Amino acid sequence: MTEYKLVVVGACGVGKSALTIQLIQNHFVDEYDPTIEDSYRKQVVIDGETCLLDILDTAGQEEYSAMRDQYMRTGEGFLCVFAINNTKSFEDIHQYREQIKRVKDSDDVPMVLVGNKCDLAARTVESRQAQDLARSYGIPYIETSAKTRQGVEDAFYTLVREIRQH
Amino acid sequence: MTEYKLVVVGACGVGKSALTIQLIQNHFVDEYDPTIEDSYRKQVVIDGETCLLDILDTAGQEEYSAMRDQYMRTGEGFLCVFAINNTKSFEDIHQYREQIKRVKDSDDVPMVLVGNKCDLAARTVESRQAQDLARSYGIPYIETSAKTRQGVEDAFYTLVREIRQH
Lengths: 166, 166
Ligand SMILES: Nc1nc2c(ncn2[C@@H]2O[C@H](COP(=O)(O)OP(=O)(O)NP(=O)(O)O)[C@@H](O)[C@H]2O)c(=O)[nH]1
Ligand SMILES: Nc1nc2c(ncn2[C@@H]2O[C@H](COP(=O)(O)OP(=O)(O)NP(=O)(O)O)[C@@H](O)[C@H]2O)c(=O)[nH]1
Ligand SMILES: [Ca+2]
Ligand SMILES: [Ca+2]
Ligand SMILES: [Ca+2]
Ligand SMILES: [Mg+2]
Ligand SMILES: [Mg+2]
Known about the structure:
2 copies of one chain form a homodimer. The first copy, chain A, has one domain (about 1-165): P-loop containing nucleotide triphosphate hydrolases (Rossmann fold, 3-Layer(aba) Sandwich). In chain A, strand 2 and strand 3 (about 50-55) form a beta hairpin. A 6-stranded mixed β-sheet of chain A has the order 2-3-1-4-5-6, with helices on both faces. By secondary structure, the first copy, chain A, is α/β, with parallel strands linked by helices. The first copy, chain A, has helices at about 15-25, 70-75, 85-90, 95-105, 125-135, 150-165; strands spanning about 1-10, 40-45, 50-55, 75-85, 110-115, 140-145. Chain A is built from 6 helices and 6 strands. The interface between A and B is medium-sized, with 28 and 28 residues. One magnesium ion binds near residues 16 and 57 of chain A.
């Protein structure tokens, strides 16, 4: 059985935990409890193949930035998440990309750019802006809502499909 | 409004028309009526962006192979479909890939490999085999069922997302 080591990264409060919990546990976490580092595992079938998802839900809090090297070495694919109502979180993506590239010593690490909170109307990052950033990285862009479940499976399953082209 | 010119290709009877009709019209065509060439259009929102899908549903019948050059020139992205219960249809994929590459004079034309009829149990093409073929092409592989609707939106929307990385 193939195991896929996925790691969810991004700035504080963009919805990393809510996305992961929605995928794994099928409910929306309304409250905000800052994460240190949590793991989830689930057996799923993706394109006819039974596999095991091992998901690491990481800290957006800058205080825990020292933990990044460790999880970037071990992860196989990265969900790089920002919130569409948080311009700064979008600007923060590049620092994650750059660290992952440096650590895995590769320009094509499996990755998906995720614009989360697409149910909210106070958008300050346009889809086209995120599309451009993802294009430069050579990776897909997918919008999600952990709240409505829109795009949540798609984002994670796309990341699996990216690990497979690797 | 961005328009995406998608073209669905593959051997006869793999489910090109059923896939397209499921996407556009939300029902499953049980009967088999061989296609000459049909067009469909639909406005959809994909990752926060309203766009227009222009879909060309092409012939799998070898008798209509002369029509291929024309539609390959005009199409922007290609859904390359085989059926997971039809080994020959999988083997036929390469002739579509090669023609598209030759016609658009490019090694990276936006494309998604689709293994359809994944609801059927008489599988003769393993996911891993199709994954390998897609990896060599540098494109995603997605399994679908036009019958159950599984993966149908995903396949077409992934092809849009591929046109965007282009
Ligand atoms: N409306 C809406 N709220 C969301 C969405 N995703 C997360 N939230 C909310 O945003 C807040 C922060 O979410 P959370 O998942 O904890 O963010 P995080 O990225 O894990 N934070 P940290 O990095 O501190 O661990 C929570 O109140 C959560 O309910 C979403 O898609 N839509
Ligand atoms: N069980 C099952 N049957 C399917 C599926 N997709 C198509 N079929 C069936 O397969 C037959 C052929 O489907 P069709 O869409 O017409 O194939 P096509 O690729 O368009 N053929 P052509 O190239 O001649 O135009 C039909 O009987 C249809 O109901 C699927 O996902 N599951
Ligand atoms: Ca809740
Ligand atoms: Ca029917
Ligand atoms: Ca989906
Ligand atoms: Mg968290
Ligand atoms: Mg047809």
